[PDB]
From a paper:
So-called major pilins polymerize head-to-tail into the pilus backbone, with ancillary pilins added at the tip (adhesin) and base (anchor). The L. rhamnosus GG genome also carries the genes for another pilus operon called spaFED9. The tertiary organization of GG-SpaD is a tandem assembly of three Ig-like domains, wherein a middle domain (M-domain) joins together the N- and C-terminal regions (N- and C-domains) of the pilin subunit.
We also solved a GG-SpaD structure where only the M- and C-domains are present (GG-SpaDMC). The crystal structure of GG-SpaDMC, which contains just the M- and C-domains, was initially obtained at resolution 1.5 Å. Found in common with the GG-SpaDC, GG-SpaDO, and GG-SpaDMC structures is that the arrangement of the M- and C-domains is linear and nearly identical, yielding a RMSD of less than 1 Å. Among the backbone pilins with a triple- or quadruple-domain structure, the N-domain is usually seen as the most flexible in nature, and thus, in many instances, its removal from the rest of the protein is needed for obtaining good X-ray-diffracting crystals. Generally, this explains why the N-domain degrades while undergoing crystallization or does not form crystals at all.
Numbering used by the authors: 184 to 226, 232 to 344, 348 to 481
Write the structure that this text describes.
Amino acid sequence: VTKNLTEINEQAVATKDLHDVAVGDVLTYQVQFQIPHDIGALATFKYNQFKVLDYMTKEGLTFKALTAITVDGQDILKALTGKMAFMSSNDAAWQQTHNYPFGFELDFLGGTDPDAVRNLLTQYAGKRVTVAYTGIVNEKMIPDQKVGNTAEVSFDKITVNGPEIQTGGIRFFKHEAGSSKSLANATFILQRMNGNVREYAVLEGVNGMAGTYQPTKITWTTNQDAATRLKTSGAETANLTIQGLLPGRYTLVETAAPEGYEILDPTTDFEVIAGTWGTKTIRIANTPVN
Ligand SMILES: [Cl-]
């Protein structure tokens, strides 16, 4: 049995055991295993269960869809749909059945029509079958945490672990020049260079948030006026934080100082460090003028 993360946002990615992800990313996984050569055999059938359980013990992914079940280049999901047993972590029964924040269980022979399913699998006896599915990186995917999954295949088991995923974040502390006084209501936008194209962050799911940003998705625009205006809180230690970012270079661009202040540093260049909140909370001064 194998498990791999094969795509991010429907683009193929290189196989490795650790991937950096952004919040809102759609991750494609594949779990592959062999149909027994004697899947069709009489013992009354020898096989009455053919189960795939896939789960994560840590938060950060929401189940999206079972996308394909393929063998020998043939997608057989259309033929199998409605005949099998299936539950995911989106279903109300999941938590009490399998106490994990993410996962699914597919029992090829546990549904209403196991004979039909067994007959189909018998056409591909001894061949490798791939179950593909997607998940969505959600607002509970926090930095400083590598999270992985486990798949188990059983006929009454074999277990494998998938790759780990992680995300980045950053913290700033906007303050009055010369002191540690927290300044609320400074306005920033988040900028990056994607190749030679300057782009700005659009955060979904952050209406009503200030200071702490925990978006459900981050996309990028070349229309600067469409960028989400991020606001500092008056909090003590870090009054602007963002999570769910890919590693690399960014610029925090100050578009308005708080009332009674002027901008000192229009641009703050910084790095997101893969999988972490970064080296330190980045202090940014504003100049008092009242
Ligand atoms: Cl930039």
